[PDB]
Amino acid sequence: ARNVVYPLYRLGGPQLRVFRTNFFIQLVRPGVAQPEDTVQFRIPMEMTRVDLRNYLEGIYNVPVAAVRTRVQHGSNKRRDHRNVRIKKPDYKVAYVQLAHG
Amino acid sequence: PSNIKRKNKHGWVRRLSTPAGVQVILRRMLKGRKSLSH
Amino acid sequence: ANFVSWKSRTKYTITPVKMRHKQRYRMIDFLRFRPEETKSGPFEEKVIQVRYDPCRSADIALVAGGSRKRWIIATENMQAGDTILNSNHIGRMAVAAREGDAHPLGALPVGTLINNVESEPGRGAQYIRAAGTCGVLLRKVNGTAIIQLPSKRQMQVLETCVATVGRVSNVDHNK
Amino acid sequence: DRVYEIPGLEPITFAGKMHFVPWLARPIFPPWDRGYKDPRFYRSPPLHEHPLYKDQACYIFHHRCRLLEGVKQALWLTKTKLIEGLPEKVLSLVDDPRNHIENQDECVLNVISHARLWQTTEEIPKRETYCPVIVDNLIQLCKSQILKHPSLARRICVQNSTFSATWNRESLLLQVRGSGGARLSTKDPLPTIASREEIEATKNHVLETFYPISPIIDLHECNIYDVKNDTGFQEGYPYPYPHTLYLLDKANLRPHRLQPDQLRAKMILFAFGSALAQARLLYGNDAKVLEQPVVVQSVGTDGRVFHFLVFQLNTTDLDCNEGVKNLAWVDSDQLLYQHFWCLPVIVEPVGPVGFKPETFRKFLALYLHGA
Amino acid sequence: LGQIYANNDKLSKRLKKVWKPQLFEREFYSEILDKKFTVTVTMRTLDLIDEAYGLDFYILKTPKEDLCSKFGMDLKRGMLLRLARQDPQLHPEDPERRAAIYDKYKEFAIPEEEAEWVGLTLEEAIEKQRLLEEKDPVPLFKIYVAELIQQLQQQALS
Amino acid sequence: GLEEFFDDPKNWGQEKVKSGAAWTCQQLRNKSNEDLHKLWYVLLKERNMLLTLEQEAKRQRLPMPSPERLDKVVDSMDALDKVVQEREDALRLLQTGQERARPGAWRRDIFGRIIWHKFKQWVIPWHLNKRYNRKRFFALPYVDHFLRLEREKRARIKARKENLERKKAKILLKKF
RNA sequence: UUAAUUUAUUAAUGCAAACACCUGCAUUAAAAA
RNA sequence: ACAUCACCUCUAGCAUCACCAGUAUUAGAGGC
């Protein structure tokens, strides 16, 4: 979940569970050549690699073998009529290598 | 140019460290500056 | 400013200390007569190495007694393997001391060269400390000794303050 | 705040708020104790309620303790005679030409050159890099003799082996905790070297004692200790008898390295500890004279300067200052090559200079003991 | 903190002067609080002590502006609370002396509520008040249960 | 599997996909917490598909087939969040009487302004929290002048606004 | 700086107060206006 | 150039924040 406080964990405490996940995901077409088992996602900044693995495995029943992440920097080189910089937002790209060939 | 040096001398923490820096920040907040510190 | 002095170690240590050409600091024990834990009275000590010290003009001696090593300041003829008595007992007669041992000023033949002189009983040795220096025990009155510092200013100290005999090592540091 | 002095009233503090305020009194807080145990924030009890805090302070000699005068402390601490030079028995194992590797000198030379020059991508291999390799390669050369002596199939070279041994001398309690690499283990024990006459003649010997420094200096004061004799293995372990302790000084910096005297004292104490653990395991914790004294040897090395020790442990009544005494044979400052040039100087080609093969012959003799 | 003229002549320079009192580390005994207090005072403090006949009377007589001390008002608040509470902890197992001292200062007897707020700086009073009215919010469950019970009572009487 | 990220292949390139009304809050109030749970995940999948399609349309330089249903899914999920949140706060008011889920306080920072400080979760209590005790929840007397000047700045802005409204009303009455 | 007069101070003294530190009142200098 | 080794001059008989964790063959203040 995004934009929420997480309950603090202490030793021998209950598992943290999220019941209605708040972060949403898109699978986008790669801009370059990729291996056959690689699926590319655009992902929220807060969502981690473990979170993405569990997300796909649970919601979509996709067996995931590897996950990699990078943060893409959006351009700040473009201006209003007021010479004020306009930001294209940064985003997170995930690369998911599927399992079982 | 150095980011460590810049944030060490003109940063938020350095400003709030002393009453004079708090007054700098208060002056800038009264003026309406977008950037109160480095 | 952000000045934190390096002079921050609490416990006495035989090892050099990184201090702020580069030098490391050897901690000198100027309280020459200190009995160690669960010991008292006079005690012998052995010279292991007579070492150059960057922090000062005289050279120093790593000197081990019982269960503790310590850095003391060297006298002119002090060899590796030499044995030195750190004494406390003020004798009835004078003590015909050797070149490098430390005695209360009541236990010395008057008119001998001394060095590393205290100012109070238990003060620690503040004076006659640089290279090749020496001071002569001029005369003593009841519970009192009078010293001639190398600046020829005489000093009245108590009888039971410890001073080491002989002159400080590394002579011809001047020349 | 003076309000804390007035017998009637309770000071008003910023404890109601959860922050400091300069115009309200500072609250007094109870000593907070975390309810649960969390390993990353554990505070050990002060050194009184540890389950083993003995008032009688023990002295520990670990792998680090550099002795003051050196060997003398070792003989005194162990009550052992010191005879210069190895016995005739061991040196006679290599007296013949038949007990020799083919191209012996050249083979040893190649091991040296590998260790010091041909080892790594780096131009000049460093001490940590060439000391243990010289050791292990020498044991490999020696192990190349299994053809002539099949009994060498009954020995192994185990590492990360730690032994412990406790003994009393006068009123001082000593405990050795040997943690060093390359301990050689044999199924068969080493036969006694010292016969009856030498041990029975050692009685007249008096061990020389020094002053003023106590013969306990630079050993570790330790009050939280256990009087436990650990031979370094579980019971019913094959190859249970120590043969040779290979100890190496592999520090680059000169101060970080043991002086040769201190290293010899190191090996004396280590061999004694190994033998003492074996004695206590085989005979119980009884201070007595052994009818089957235990012989254990050690090889100490700096990387090029070798030293050999053979220790004969024959008494367990260490507390007394008289009676039979242990005895150790030492070969000291046995450098195996004078120097090694890694770059040609312009005159002197790359390689070792001053190679003397007698040092390795002694090495081979020690290795072949018990074979 | 003032200024003076160099030699008591107005045709001289004006130069800054500070006049400091003489501080004496004296030691007194508050009978009503029954405590030895070490206090830094002035000779004038000893004079008003003498004229007021005791530290007790001096403290409960001298007003806030004349005392000009926070410690003085802490002592005052303690004293007035001890009077108002009729507190037996002055001298345990000693009632006649307690009664003697308590009657000795009957004049300055005050209600306890008034004594509670005496000598408090404004921030201290706000802190006390905010403690006082700090209550855990009562759950709507019992409000609604009581309301339902009340409605059932009203319906029953119909 | 991964086909759920794209809608039925029969609709690919249709340029107009028919969709029904979005869930209202009132409709969702009649459903159980479990029906709300599963409906949440249904809408999660649907929104992921629609976001995927929107991005792919941007990539192909083509208009999205029917962008209204994305808004409808978003509105449906906001309604579901509102419904569940209402239930949670009703229960919290009943059991505890508190109005907010996160504990907080009315504090006064270094700049002298009243703020609602929201509390965080910590393991150690506050008096031995080194970092927390560096923060200053009080203002020194050098702030009150700046507080007064800010007050006057706000007063100026309000006066300008109210006067401008009155002038505009005069103009409106003049024209009409 | 040996212009003006002064010592706010800092270092000393002397005298008051108190039972040495702290304070008040004068004097002599350095650094000062 | 200053600093700094080195050199010269003057002051200083001494301890816990520099000098200094130093003690007149020394240290500081200057100058080059």
Add this chain to the structure above:
RNA sequence: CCUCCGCAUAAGCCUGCGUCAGAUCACUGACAAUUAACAGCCCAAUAUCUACAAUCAACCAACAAGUCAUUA
């Protein structure tokens, strides 16, 4: 035909000659991308150990006297 330059990292800068499209000696809009093993980001306490330079470290060669470690 030049090459006294280049290639990486650091520091700094922040998408600043990738693709598609347009305008402007002859930048704008849209889309896309940098995937950790390299490097950051560390360390459970309480005491208690840390005299012997580097220079191929072996002599020699010295002074300005040195850059390094644990145990219970």
Add this chain to the structure above:
RNA sequence: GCUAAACCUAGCCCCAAACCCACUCCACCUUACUACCAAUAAAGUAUAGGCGAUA
């Protein structure tokens, strides 16, 4: 005839009246925006003052 000219209304000013602001979620004193550990008049009068400039 090029360059250009022209335009009213954004808003603002001075008053009056009235005592203002400040938690969607989340983040922010560490390198901020970082989940988590030791009236008028009296009157320019009386007065003060290198008794003067002035007050």
